[PDB]
Amino acid sequence: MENFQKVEKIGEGTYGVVYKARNKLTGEVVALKKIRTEGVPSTAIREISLLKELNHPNIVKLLDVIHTENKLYLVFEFLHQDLKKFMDASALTGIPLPLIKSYLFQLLQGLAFCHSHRVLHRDLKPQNLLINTEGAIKLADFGLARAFGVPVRTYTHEVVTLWYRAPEILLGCKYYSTAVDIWSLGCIFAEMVTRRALFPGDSEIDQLFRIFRTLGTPDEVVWPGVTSMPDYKPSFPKWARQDFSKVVPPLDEDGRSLLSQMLHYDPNKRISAKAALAHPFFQDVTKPVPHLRL
């Protein structure tokens, strides 16, 4: 750490405080993420170490891992804004569709890359999607979930949001897959379009029931095996599925079609990042440069 000058406290991360800092020997401006006691387990150090080679232009670059006095810091490429802040800022007018389309397409490339190596995010959320002045968007904290877990509360006891959590996680599946990230990104896509979170649950049952109210209560017809999952209850209320036309106006037929595929209940049938990239929604994708005030 004495290789760095902290600049400001940036944020409270999932795992610890996040600092903006400058490397005294190289000038680089970085994000430093403290990872909150018998030292760091050796398994977590090896997992993190693999993430140093999982490099992609839509994945926030992991520069280095600093483990001293049994205290752990991750050094990351610094980006100046996140999608949560950008959405809050664009509330009056909404993010223009070409920009939505570009961010979704970039995020899907990020996912297609990571998922080709069977690495998951598992906690995608706007606060994790970071943006630069060149029109890029990038996934932050990719693979930390496998390395450190996803806690119910953060180190500051802030509630970890359930809003982007896939139904198979909520229903207690042990061995969920890359599809969980597709679900999260679908929820984000919808939030970009509508300017409101799709499923803003405030408990696990509220999260599930919000999902069911919009998409229909899942059954063995649309999701084979669902009634056998650990937290499935036969007594769940039975809601009918809503039309996507009601859910995400004014999204066009292509975007509604894609969204529907990203929100399929059955994780086997949910579209892959690779397949999503071929969807007709992206036929006319561009890379607009957003209006950013820093």
Ligand SMILES: COc1ncnc2[nH]cnc12
């Ligand atoms: C808040 O987290 C962060 N802020 C700015 N840059 C980052 N890079 C990775 N995490 C970041």
